[PDB]
């Protein structure tokens, strides 16, 4: 699982579930891609799947409602699974956290 995916750990509030978890990916223009927002919940690893294509500028914005992550969850990993060309996460915003991946 971890070993074949490209990994981006995160932590969040256990309580606040307003808005979206928004993720910016940069990659080959017109590539197709998928992955998840994974997290631990009561000792299970749960996955919210995402998928999309990069546009002509190489950009892919993924939006996942925060409501999909159960209350009490405080940590996880954004993962890239399939990437037809190149893909990397550059940024995400969840709740009050504006994160840049250097
Ligand atoms: C605010 As930061 C250190 O997660 O880019």
Q: Is 100 in the pocket of ligand 1 (CB under 6 A)?
A: yes
Q: In angstroms, rounded to a whole number, what is the distance separating the alpha carbons of residues 22 and 72?
A: 20
Q: In angstroms, rounded to a whole number, what is the distance separating the alpha carbons of residues 92 and 102?
A: 12
Question: What are the phi and psi torsion angles at 22 (to 5°)?
Answer: -110, 135
Nearest to 12 by CA among 99, 101, 88, 100: 99
Q: Whose CA is nearest to atom 1 of ligand 1?
A: 99
Residue 87: give the domain boundaries: 1-102
**Index of the ligand 1 atom closest to the CA of residue 97:** 1
Q: What residues are designated binding site? A: 44-45
Domain tally for the chain? 1
Experimentally, the structure was elucidated by X-ray
Residue written as token pair 């992550």: 69
Supply the DSSP string of 46-79, one letter for each residue: EEEEEEEE--TTSEEEEEEEGGGSPTT--EEEEE
Asked if 21 and 66 touch (Cβ cutoff 8 Å), the reply is yes
Nearest to 2 by CA among 47, 32, 41, 43: 47
């Amino acid at each position: 699982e971890e070993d074949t995916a490209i990994l981006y750990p995160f932590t969040i509030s256990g309580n606040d579930r307003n808005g979206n978890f928004t993720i910016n990916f940069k990659g080959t223009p017109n590539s197709t891609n998928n992955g998840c927002i994974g997290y631990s919940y009561n000792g299970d690893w749960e996955k919210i799947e995402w998928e999309g294509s990069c546009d002509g500028n190489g950009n892919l914005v993924v939006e996942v409602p925060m409501s999909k992550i159960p209350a009490g969850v405080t940590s996880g990993e954004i993962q890239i699974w399939w990437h037809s060309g190149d893909l990397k996460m550059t940024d995400y915003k969840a709740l009050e956290h504006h994160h840049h991946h250097h």
